[PDB]
Design an enzyme around this catalytic site. Structure first.
Site, PDB file in Angstrom:
ATOM      1  N   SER A  24     -14.664  18.601  29.873  1.00 23.48           N
ATOM      2  CA  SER A  24     -13.906  19.103  28.717  1.00 23.48           C
ATOM      3  C   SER A  24     -14.021  20.612  28.512  1.00 23.48           C
ATOM      4  CB  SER A  24     -14.287  18.362  27.425  1.00 23.48           C
ATOM      5  OG  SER A  24     -15.698  18.195  27.333  1.00 23.48           O
ATOM      6  N   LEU A  70     -23.193  18.874  26.682  1.00 24.16           N
ATOM      7  CA  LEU A  70     -24.155  18.279  27.582  1.00 24.16           C
ATOM      8  C   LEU A  70     -23.605  18.597  28.971  1.00 24.16           C
ATOM      9  CD1 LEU A  70     -26.508  16.736  26.300  1.00 24.16           C
ATOM     10  CD2 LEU A  70     -25.004  14.699  26.387  1.00 24.16           C
ATOM     11  N   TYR A 164      -8.443  10.968  47.044  1.00 22.56           N
ATOM     12  CA  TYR A 164      -8.417  11.063  45.580  1.00 22.56           C
ATOM     13  C   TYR A 164      -7.580   9.916  45.010  1.00 22.56           C
ATOM     14  CZ  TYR A 164      -6.432  12.850  41.119  1.00 22.56           C
ATOM     15  OH  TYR A 164      -5.995  13.003  39.831  1.00 22.56           O
TER      16      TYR A 164
END
Ligand SMILES: NC(=O)c1ccc[n+]([C@@H]2O[C@H](COP(=O)([O-])OP(=O)(O)OC[C@H]3O[C@@H](n4cnc5c(N)ncnc54)[C@H](OP(=O)(O)O)[C@@H]3O)[C@@H](O)[C@H]2O)c1
Ligand SMILES: NC(=O)c1ccc[n+]([C@@H]2O[C@H](COP(=O)([O-])OP(=O)(O)OC[C@H]3O[C@@H](n4cnc5c(N)ncnc54)[C@H](OP(=O)(O)O)[C@@H]3O)[C@@H](O)[C@H]2O)c1
Ligand SMILES: NC(=O)c1ccc[n+]([C@@H]2O[C@H](COP(=O)([O-])OP(=O)(O)OC[C@H]3O[C@@H](n4cnc5c(N)ncnc54)[C@H](OP(=O)(O)O)[C@@H]3O)[C@@H](O)[C@H]2O)c1
Ligand SMILES: NC(=O)c1ccc[n+]([C@@H]2O[C@H](COP(=O)([O-])OP(=O)(O)OC[C@H]3O[C@@H](n4cnc5c(N)ncnc54)[C@H](OP(=O)(O)O)[C@@H]3O)[C@@H](O)[C@H]2O)c1
Lengths: 258, 253, 253, 258
Positions: A24, A70, A164
């Site tokens: 993020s 985090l 992917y």
């Protein structure tokens, strides 16, 4: 106090909930993180290196939300388990947005053992690990939302992203098998699968080659354009909230028509 | 428009992984019966002896290449060995690893093993085989999938996810090589009576009968031989306008 | 990035067919709550009085246009009437006809009636509405579908087939008008508690509870209000990069 | 007498079975009819006007098969019922190939009430009627095959064929609901959905405009070409025989990759 059923805040509001959004620091994950905080969730931001989420954190705070970081590389064995455990030590994690992913382009002839293993480790390995730690915790609390970021390549893959695409198909399959197990506990899992979106992954190409890029995007999808990260946000809020209480194991495709 | 003209495989060679028994054995015998030379495969040398004997007994030809597909590079070694024997026109990707476990009981070792066999050896075989097929301007891959690739149950959490990745590879490669007449498709069975479930079946026949009765619309398990028509279709000229697709043989589901 | 900035509909007008009760009523109130002026609809004049009263009571605005969508040209007349009141930005195609019958009991009259309402009026409404939306360079169609559009049961043989045709229209038109910002998508519910099943539900509650318990992964019927978030998403700027698609709200299925 | 299980004739053979193939005077229906007769079925051919099937009948006979004609316009009310009843008066109908269909191109703005009703009458109406008469008869005999010819447009429609595409979606939906009902009676229904195929429907355009046509087909599908009618035959034999005994309610897409 009356007609509460039908208000935007009732339907999509997240006050009192906590979301962990992987990757993020920027792109789709950043947009989603800000949207979630905008609806009232406390957001645990994540990126590879300490401090990579600082700008998104401050945008969230400036808009009156709360967030903290985090960090950690999800390619490491046990990294997904450790991330969840660290997040849970901050607060119960009600919402998990599985957004960070590894992508190295290669057709089959160019696919190396190293590249395949790396993309598996991040896209499948850490996904398995995070779900394995998070889901029992959500089940115990009788409420949970997983919003897995997939790709149009999970369903109609191109060989330029052979490995992917294959990891994205496996990833949605996990979302499905687990949704089926835990629906009865109000722990719901769905995939948000974007088509082409303007992010850093193509920031350089857009800037260096506008003519080419425009001719390409013009016939890629029915809208003839790339999506913007913020265009993922509504779908993420839907999938992260009370709004999807009767929906699990599904995919929302945001591809500009494809 | 004789059956032989539509599905015939005279002059072609097929490699069928896991053709010692079950679905792979039935498919191998069907291909050989349509005229393909068949290269059979199993974990250990001699594992395919019976299927080879039945093929030869009915007038077909076959031989064996063994090898554990869980080992690093095994898919590559298998294709290279088969190509040194004859051009491999048809690849049936049938052998797979399945270790039942819900997410709470899924270990990293079990995950790695299923990935190595179901995705790892698949990638390695296709990486070796497709360029050979393309240069010859004809090829068929019949990937044996599963209903779990599409509507997974957590009892096979890891295996289901590998089957989804495997079919995705089939689609991306189909799209690349269709112009070379090298076609790839998935044959995805629902429940089929094999050794993999002989033990349950022998062990609680009522529990079993009651589970199959409501599993699919026919209320029964399929037989390995019911996979064969579909494999012949996907292995032959018959599917010349079909690629990147899946045939689901699930009894209705 | 406030909810209001993402899903807000101030300045837009929505027409919701069959908004007198059930799913359409909940959707209408949700749209009005997000700021849309709502035009409500039901078979007979006055059928939507209660929903209109609740919308006004909560500070929204609404009015009624009634009409039986089974009659020839009714969809066209409905859109023309609504457009004479205000630009219709958002069309929710919710009213439908459903006459239960397996194939052996499907009559030509019942087939024609379900076609007239579910496909006929849909075609007529879109034929009238889409060009208006395109000229304004913004539009949303939220077609209420069904899980039966994808995995049909013969108990609703005809209705299921109409819902499949209806979603197909949604996709073909989505593909045409995406470049004009006129987006069309289907919201496809599984089982939802409405009047359509109040009678069964009241009439054999054990038979009912036992059927819902095993129907879907949550083991329950949805509530009309659980359709609303999804309708708001498909009716607003929020779905600006999404068109031709389906959201399934089935309780897991 | 030994190893019979694995022979082409056992797997795909149709001796002793009878097939009705609608619209078998030419195109895909003709190819399929000849293929079925080639596998041993007695074939009831169908076309709009008496004698339209004469050339296909004689090709079937010349190859050592048997065939006879039943004619009729399927746009007429009750026509599907009447066709089945007439076919059953010849022989039990084991296999029904629903191939004849109506197609009038038009985008939504050009779709007329007449054209919509005609395409419904043929594609949906006669389909409902034929299944309604045929299925109980197959169920009573404990064996049946319906091979419905659909279209890639049933799944990914283009507006140039708005109404037609919508009827093909409804048609496959019927195949699904009925497959689910009658699987337990060995009465199986599946859809064979072609992409672009060289038939009369485009014979004129190909001939009058080869340059254009080739540029168009080159980027239409992954093979960069139209299919030939005979390329539908293998899939039809599969769906019409013992070979699909564990498959029902499904679609086989023959689109050249799409
Ligand atoms: N962009 C598109 O067109 C597109 C299309 C379809 C699907 N998607 C999917 O959408 C999601 C987000 O895409 P995006 O374009 O926004 O990606 P992005 O802008 O390149 O950012 C990826 C994010 O994931 C984190 N990340 C990357 N590798 C990592 C690793 N090994 N360990 C931990 N974190 C890692 C990054 O952290 P740092 O900032 O610290 O590097 C970053 O925050 C992905 O799942 C992607 O597959 C994107
Ligand atoms: N049975 C079902 O219900 C079902 C349902 C859906 C899909 N499928 C799929 O159908 C395919 C065949 O299934 P089946 O039930 O017929 O399997 P089976 O009866 O267990 O036979 C498996 C075959 O694969 C070979 N094999 C297994 N592990 C291997 C390894 N590590 N390396 C090399 N070869 C290996 C075996 O060789 P050895 O004889 O030497 O051990 C055997 O020939 C599989 O892809 C399976 O996933 C099966
Ligand atoms: N309920 C479920 O379980 C379920 C499941 C899947 C999909 N759906 C779909 O969801 C949508 C709404 O269902 P619901 O159960 O909420 O329906 P409902 O409670 O029966 O309400 C139906 C609404 O449609 C209107 N309507 C019915 N026939 C009409 C006609 N011929 N002309 C004009 N208006 C007509 C009714 O108007 P009046 O009030 O004037 O009669 C009413 O407002 C439908 O499209 C249905 O197919 C429902
Ligand atoms: N060609 C393609 O590219 C393509 C692609 C996808 C799907 N399909 C589908 O494949 C099937 C066959 O297509 P085709 O291209 O082979 O068609 P075609 O060559 O134009 O022939 C259609 C056949 O159906 C019969 N037919 C037409 N209208 C009829 C009516 N009102 N009543 C009774 N019979 C009628 C015709 O009989 P007469 O000879 O007496 O006129 C003819 O035998 C159709 O379902 C079509 O939708 C075709």
């Amino acid at each position: 106090l009356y007609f509460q059923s039908m208000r935007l805040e009732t339907i999509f509001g997240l006050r009192g909930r906590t979301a962990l959004v992987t990757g993020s620091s920027r792109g789709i994950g950043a947009a989603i993180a800000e949207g979630l905080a905008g609806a009232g969730a406390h957001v645990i931001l994540h990126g590879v290196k300490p401090g990579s989420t600082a700008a998104v954190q401050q945008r969230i705070i400036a808009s009156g939300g709360t967030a903290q970081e985090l960090a950690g590389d999800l390619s490491e064995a046990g990294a997904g388990t450790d991330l969840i455990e660290r997040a849970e030590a901050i607060a119960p994690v009600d919402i998990l947005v599985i957004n960070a992913s590894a992508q190295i382009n290669a057709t089959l002839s160019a696919l190396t053992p190293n590249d395949l293993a790396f993309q598996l480790a991040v896209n499948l390995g850490s996904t398995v690990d995070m779900l394995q730690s998070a889901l029992p915790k959500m089940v115990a609390r009788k409420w949970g939302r997983v919003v897995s970021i997939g790709s149009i390549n999970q369903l109609r893959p191109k060989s330029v992203v052979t490995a992917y695409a294959a990891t994205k198909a496996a990833q949605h399959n996990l979302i499905q098998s687990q949704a089926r197990d835990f629906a009865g506990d109000n722990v719901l899992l769905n995939t948000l699968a974007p088509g082409l979106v303007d992010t850093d992954r193509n920031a350089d190409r857009r800037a260096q080659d506008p003519e080419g890029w425009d001719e390409y995007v013009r016939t890629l999808n029915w809208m003839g354009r790339a999506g913007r990260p913020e265009e993922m946000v509504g779908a993420a809020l839907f999938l992260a909230s009370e709004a999807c209480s009767f929906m699990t194991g599904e995919t929302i495709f945001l591809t500009g028509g494809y």
